[PDB]
Homo-oligomer: A and B are copies of this chain.
């Protein structure tokens, strides 16, 4: 967009670092502030309002202990489907 163009011109390092984040996590602005800053508790259900009549219902069921590589398994449910995500514990 034209908005992309002056944005880059105005903030080259920042804007690229923004697009890098967008590529990794999608549109974070949709998240509620508590979720944005703190994530989710065990057993919590969060509803992310994407757009008119479309939303992500997410339940965090449990986080596992880290494997030998320091990776944790997160057991999620999202829109009625079981889901497993791996995060490296820093």
Interface residues in chain A, defined as those with a beta carbon under 8 Å from any beta carbon in chain B:
42-43, 61-62, 64-65, 67, 73, 75, 82
12 pairs, CB–CB < 8 Å, chain A vs chain B: A42-B64, A42-B65, A43-B67, A61-B64, A61-B73, A62-B62, A62-B64, A62-B65, A62-B73, A62-B75, A75-B75, A82-B82
* Chain B nearest CB, measured from A69 CB (Å): 11
Q: How many copies does the complex hold?
A: 2
Which residues on B sit within 8 Å (CB–CB) of A61?
64, 73
Which residues on B sit within 8 Å (CB–CB) of A75?
62, 75
Cβ-closest chain B residue relative to A63? B62
Which residues on B sit within 8 Å (CB–CB) of A67?
43
